[PDB]
mmCIF file of C-alpha atoms and ligand atoms in Angstrom:
data_model
loop_
_atom_site.group_PDB
_atom_site.id
_atom_site.type_symbol
_atom_site.label_atom_id
_atom_site.label_comp_id
_atom_site.label_asym_id
_atom_site.label_seq_id
_atom_site.Cartn_x
_atom_site.Cartn_y
_atom_site.Cartn_z
ATOM 1 C CA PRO A 1 120.357 85.698 110.015
ATOM 2 C CA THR A 2 119.971 81.497 109.526
ATOM 3 C CA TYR A 3 116.240 81.687 109.416
ATOM 4 C CA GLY A 4 115.663 80.625 105.137
ATOM 5 C CA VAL A 5 114.729 82.075 102.664
ATOM 6 C CA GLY A 6 110.858 83.034 103.668
ATOM 7 C CA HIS A 7 111.148 84.334 106.937
ATOM 8 C CA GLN A 8 113.953 86.790 106.177
ATOM 9 C CA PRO A 9 113.180 90.502 107.104
ATOM 10 C CA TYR A 10 111.819 92.385 103.774
ATOM 11 C CA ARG A 11 111.479 97.122 103.559
ATOM 12 C CA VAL A 12 108.048 97.209 102.027
ATOM 13 C CA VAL A 13 107.797 100.993 100.324
ATOM 14 C CA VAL A 14 104.048 101.401 99.051
ATOM 15 C CA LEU A 15 103.761 104.770 96.792
ATOM 16 C CA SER A 16 99.321 105.507 97.401
ATOM 17 C CA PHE A 17 99.157 108.214 94.217
ATOM 18 C CA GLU A 18 95.325 109.501 94.944
ATOM 19 C CA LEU A 19 93.827 111.001 90.802
ATOM 20 C CA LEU A 20 93.719 114.329 90.123
ATOM 21 C CA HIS A 21 89.649 115.995 90.723
ATOM 22 C CA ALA A 22 92.006 118.959 92.960
ATOM 23 C CA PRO A 23 94.488 121.148 90.779
ATOM 24 C CA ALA A 24 98.285 118.964 90.517
ATOM 25 C CA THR A 25 100.482 119.842 92.667
ATOM 26 C CA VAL A 26 103.486 117.130 91.614
ATOM 27 C CA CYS A 27 104.358 116.816 88.320
ATOM 28 C CA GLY A 28 106.752 113.962 85.735
ATOM 29 C CA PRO A 29 109.126 116.116 83.624
ATOM 30 C CA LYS A 30 107.584 117.047 80.742
ATOM 31 C CA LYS A 31 108.362 120.413 78.910
ATOM 32 C CA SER A 32 105.516 123.034 78.752
ATOM 33 C CA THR A 33 103.871 123.821 74.873
ATOM 34 C CA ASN A 34 102.955 127.743 74.401
ATOM 35 C CA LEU A 35 98.934 127.213 74.148
ATOM 36 C CA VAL A 36 97.251 128.292 70.695
ATOM 37 C CA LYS A 37 94.101 128.786 70.171
ATOM 38 C CA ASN A 38 90.670 127.706 67.554
ATOM 39 C CA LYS A 39 92.722 125.127 65.438
ATOM 40 C CA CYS A 40 92.732 121.523 65.645
ATOM 41 C CA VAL A 41 95.564 121.017 67.822
ATOM 42 C CA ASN A 42 96.252 117.951 70.000
ATOM 43 C CA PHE A 43 96.365 119.123 73.647
ATOM 44 C CA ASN A 44 97.674 117.768 76.382
ATOM 45 C CA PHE A 45 96.234 118.977 80.284
ATOM 46 C CA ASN A 46 97.272 117.978 83.119
ATOM 47 C CA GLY A 47 98.341 114.360 81.765
ATOM 48 C CA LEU A 48 94.636 113.835 79.919
ATOM 49 C CA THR A 49 95.077 114.056 76.398
ATOM 50 C CA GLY A 50 92.656 114.027 72.983
ATOM 51 C CA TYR B 1 108.693 58.436 92.177
ATOM 52 C CA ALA B 2 107.701 56.731 95.422
ATOM 53 C CA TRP B 3 106.159 60.262 96.605
ATOM 54 C CA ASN B 4 104.485 59.471 100.310
ATOM 55 C CA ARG B 5 100.350 60.484 101.375
ATOM 56 C CA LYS B 6 98.907 61.453 104.109
ATOM 57 C CA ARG B 7 95.689 61.311 104.440
ATOM 58 C CA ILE B 8 93.685 63.627 107.187
ATOM 59 C CA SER B 9 90.444 63.591 108.167
ATOM 60 C CA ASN B 10 88.409 63.721 111.645
ATOM 61 C CA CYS B 11 89.873 67.295 112.777
ATOM 62 C CA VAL B 12 89.978 70.828 112.801
ATOM 63 C CA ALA B 13 92.652 72.269 109.829
ATOM 64 C CA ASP B 14 93.918 75.870 110.974
ATOM 65 C CA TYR B 15 95.788 76.778 107.664
ATOM 66 C CA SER B 16 97.523 79.264 109.216
ATOM 67 C CA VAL B 17 100.156 77.691 111.174
ATOM 68 C CA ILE B 18 101.578 76.388 108.114
ATOM 69 C CA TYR B 19 103.262 79.564 107.748
ATOM 70 C CA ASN B 20 104.933 79.339 110.826
ATOM 71 C CA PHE B 21 106.674 74.883 110.143
ATOM 72 C CA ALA B 22 108.061 75.475 106.845
ATOM 73 C CA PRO B 23 109.615 79.317 104.865
ATOM 74 C CA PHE B 24 108.204 79.542 101.369
ATOM 75 C CA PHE B 25 107.193 81.958 100.316
ATOM 76 C CA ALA B 26 103.705 81.414 98.615
ATOM 77 C CA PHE B 27 100.942 79.350 99.907
ATOM 78 C CA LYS B 28 99.683 78.033 95.735
ATOM 79 C CA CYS B 29 96.197 77.543 95.746
ATOM 80 C CA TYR B 30 94.958 76.787 92.379
ATOM 81 C CA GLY B 31 90.769 76.422 93.273
ATOM 82 C CA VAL B 32 90.501 78.000 96.334
ATOM 83 C CA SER B 33 91.873 81.057 97.603
ATOM 84 C CA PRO B 34 94.740 81.066 100.321
ATOM 85 C CA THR B 35 92.817 84.005 102.220
ATOM 86 C CA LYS B 36 89.669 81.580 102.224
ATOM 87 C CA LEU B 37 90.830 78.035 103.834
ATOM 88 C CA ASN B 38 89.577 78.171 107.317
ATOM 89 C CA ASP B 39 85.392 79.145 106.451
ATOM 90 C CA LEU B 40 84.590 76.721 104.548
ATOM 91 C CA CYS B 41 85.131 72.822 104.741
ATOM 92 C CA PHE B 42 85.741 69.896 103.201
ATOM 93 C CA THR B 43 85.654 65.912 103.284
ATOM 94 C CA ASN B 44 89.164 64.484 102.629
ATOM 95 C CA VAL B 45 92.922 66.415 102.708
ATOM 96 C CA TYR B 46 95.535 64.466 100.809
ATOM 97 C CA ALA B 47 99.265 65.646 101.824
ATOM 98 C CA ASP B 48 101.483 64.795 99.054
ATOM 99 C CA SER B 49 105.607 65.208 99.567
ATOM 100 C CA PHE B 50 108.513 64.879 97.727
ATOM 101 C CA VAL B 51 111.887 66.514 96.666
ATOM 102 C CA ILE B 52 112.461 68.187 93.185
ATOM 103 C CA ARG B 53 114.495 69.991 91.558
ATOM 104 C CA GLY B 54 114.183 74.245 90.616
ATOM 105 C CA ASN B 55 114.096 73.522 86.472
ATOM 106 C CA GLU B 56 110.858 70.946 87.522
ATOM 107 C CA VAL B 57 108.855 73.070 90.273
ATOM 108 C CA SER B 58 107.160 74.910 87.402
ATOM 109 C CA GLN B 59 105.889 70.858 86.766
ATOM 110 C CA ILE B 60 103.002 70.726 89.750
ATOM 111 C CA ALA B 61 100.455 72.201 88.236
ATOM 112 C CA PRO B 62 97.590 70.894 85.713
ATOM 113 C CA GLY B 63 97.706 70.621 82.213
ATOM 114 C CA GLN B 64 102.115 70.559 82.212
ATOM 115 C CA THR B 65 104.192 67.983 80.361
ATOM 116 C CA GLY B 66 108.251 66.935 80.270
ATOM 117 C CA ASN B 67 109.754 64.347 82.765
ATOM 118 C CA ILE B 68 108.340 64.920 86.656
ATOM 119 C CA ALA B 69 104.221 65.518 85.086
ATOM 120 C CA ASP B 70 104.435 62.330 82.748
ATOM 121 C CA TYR B 71 106.478 59.656 83.901
ATOM 122 C CA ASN B 72 106.315 60.894 88.208
ATOM 123 C CA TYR B 73 103.286 63.124 89.076
ATOM 124 C CA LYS B 74 100.577 63.946 86.865
ATOM 125 C CA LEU B 75 98.014 66.457 89.077
ATOM 126 C CA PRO B 76 94.429 66.158 87.078
ATOM 127 C CA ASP B 77 92.958 68.840 84.623
ATOM 128 C CA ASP B 78 90.385 69.681 87.443
ATOM 129 C CA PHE B 79 92.302 70.283 90.831
ATOM 130 C CA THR B 80 90.991 72.306 93.388
ATOM 131 C CA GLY B 81 94.004 72.463 96.393
ATOM 132 C CA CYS B 82 97.357 74.163 97.319
ATOM 133 C CA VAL B 83 101.317 73.107 96.061
ATOM 134 C CA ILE B 84 103.454 74.616 98.522
ATOM 135 C CA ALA B 85 107.515 74.707 97.274
ATOM 136 C CA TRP B 86 110.588 75.936 99.183
ATOM 137 C CA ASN B 87 114.415 75.822 99.006
ATOM 138 C CA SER B 88 116.103 72.869 100.893
ATOM 139 C CA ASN B 89 119.970 73.442 100.244
ATOM 140 C CA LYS B 90 120.512 73.960 103.886
ATOM 141 C CA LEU B 91 119.467 70.001 105.314
ATOM 142 C CA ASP B 92 119.183 68.595 101.480
ATOM 143 C CA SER B 93 122.656 68.767 99.911
ATOM 144 C CA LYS B 94 125.218 67.620 100.297
ATOM 145 C CA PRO B 95 129.462 68.422 98.676
ATOM 146 C CA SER B 96 129.130 65.280 97.669
ATOM 147 C CA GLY B 97 125.744 64.473 96.188
ATOM 148 C CA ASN B 98 122.134 63.385 97.437
ATOM 149 C CA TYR B 99 122.672 60.020 95.713
ATOM 150 C CA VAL C 1 109.180 96.280 108.017
ATOM 151 C CA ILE C 2 108.020 92.439 107.402
ATOM 152 C CA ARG C 3 108.430 89.326 106.958
ATOM 153 C CA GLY C 4 108.458 87.091 103.532
ATOM 154 C CA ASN C 5 105.584 85.504 104.249
ATOM 155 C CA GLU C 6 103.232 88.953 104.317
ATOM 156 C CA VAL C 7 104.553 90.384 101.571
ATOM 157 C CA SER C 8 101.691 88.802 99.542
ATOM 158 C CA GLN C 9 99.402 90.214 102.107
ATOM 159 C CA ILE C 10 99.849 94.589 100.904
ATOM 160 C CA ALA C 11 97.319 93.991 98.270
ATOM 161 C CA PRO C 12 94.047 95.013 97.912
ATOM 162 C CA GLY C 13 91.950 92.390 99.442
ATOM 163 C CA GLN C 14 93.692 90.319 101.325
ATOM 164 C CA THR C 15 93.054 88.845 104.955
ATOM 165 C CA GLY C 16 96.064 87.707 108.045
ATOM 166 C CA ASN C 17 96.943 89.587 110.541
ATOM 167 C CA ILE C 18 99.268 92.204 108.956
ATOM 168 C CA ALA C 19 95.934 93.315 106.189
ATOM 169 C CA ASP C 20 93.704 92.654 109.497
ATOM 170 C CA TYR C 21 95.337 94.338 111.910
ATOM 171 C CA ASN C 22 98.872 96.118 110.477
ATOM 172 C CA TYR C 23 98.362 98.020 108.226
ATOM 173 C CA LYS C 24 95.209 97.535 105.769
ATOM 174 C CA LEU C 25 94.968 98.963 102.090
ATOM 175 C CA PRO C 26 91.423 99.841 100.517
ATOM 176 C CA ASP C 27 89.817 97.738 97.777
ATOM 177 C CA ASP C 28 90.148 100.692 94.765
ATOM 178 C CA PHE C 29 93.601 101.246 95.972
ATOM 179 C CA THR C 30 95.938 102.710 92.937
ATOM 180 C CA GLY C 31 99.102 102.967 93.503
ATOM 181 C CA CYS C 32 103.092 100.938 93.665
ATOM 182 C CA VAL C 33 104.711 98.698 96.150
ATOM 183 C CA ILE C 34 107.858 97.912 96.053
ATOM 184 C CA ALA C 35 109.381 95.318 98.282
ATOM 185 C CA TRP C 36 112.761 94.381 99.257
ATOM 186 C CA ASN C 37 115.491 92.100 101.272
ATOM 187 C CA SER C 38 117.098 93.648 104.378
ATOM 188 C CA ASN C 39 119.403 91.072 105.395
ATOM 189 C CA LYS C 40 121.619 92.588 106.095
ATOM 190 C CA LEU C 41 120.288 95.474 107.635
ATOM 191 C CA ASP C 42 117.744 94.239 109.910
ATOM 192 C CA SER C 43 119.609 91.301 111.187
ATOM 193 C CA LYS C 44 121.600 90.767 113.707
ATOM 194 C CA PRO C 45 123.065 86.715 115.558
ATOM 195 C CA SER C 46 121.829 87.896 118.589
ATOM 196 C CA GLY C 47 118.466 88.329 117.185
ATOM 197 C CA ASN C 48 116.646 91.904 115.846
ATOM 198 C CA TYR C 49 113.828 92.540 118.581
HETATM 199 C C1 NAG D 101 110.611 70.050 114.406
HETATM 200 O O1 NAG D 101 110.640 69.382 115.130
HETATM 201 C C2 NAG D 101 112.041 69.022 115.686
HETATM 202 C C3 NAG D 101 110.823 68.208 116.615
HETATM 203 O O2 NAG D 101 110.405 68.181 117.075
HETATM 204 C C4 NAG D 101 111.860 70.424 116.657
HETATM 205 O O3 NAG D 101 113.506 69.881 117.002
HETATM 206 C C5 NAG D 101 111.756 71.180 115.233
HETATM 207 O O4 NAG D 101 111.921 72.737 116.607
HETATM 208 C C6 NAG D 101 110.883 71.776 115.435
HETATM 209 N N1 NAG D 101 110.769 72.977 113.599
HETATM 210 C C7 NAG D 101 110.122 72.869 113.617
HETATM 211 C C8 NAG D 101 109.690 75.094 112.197
HETATM 212 O O5 NAG D 101 109.216 73.892 114.149
#
């Protein structure tokens, strides 16, 4: 504890994501909306918008 | 105002041992990368050592104005090299005030 | 757990000791690196070994 501020211990957590190529297993808390077809809509399919 | 300059030449400069000498966070360099200082090599190395306060560490940079950068210690616009700064509370501070 | 000099080494495209011999990140890395000080938990007056 008597060392300098650059010699202090540091706890590191590295969250390594990987982008969606497989079916998504971990996803954030967003409420799903019922599907409608044959209409000009905004879609949000597993994070990708359009 | 009377900063010391030390000329370093004719020796093998290992920059990885600097991290053991002083407890600084970042080896902040400007024209060169801090991790590539062992492969490439130079002609002369100068070390300028002085003491300032924490509001004025950001003034030691190419292209700043203020008190240190305008009147005490000015860096050139095409400056290549590293600036190392660390806190010195436990050695360079007194309860009565440093003069 | 590392020391404060090598927190800058946990980044893509870095060398040194941690990034060269202990824990190397890829150049196309995506994600977040979270670090905080742990002086109250990983330090002893006799020395943490
Ligand atoms: C600085 O030099 C003194 C005297 O040689 C020595 O006792 C001390 O351990 C040195 N500090 C470091 C960090 O090397």
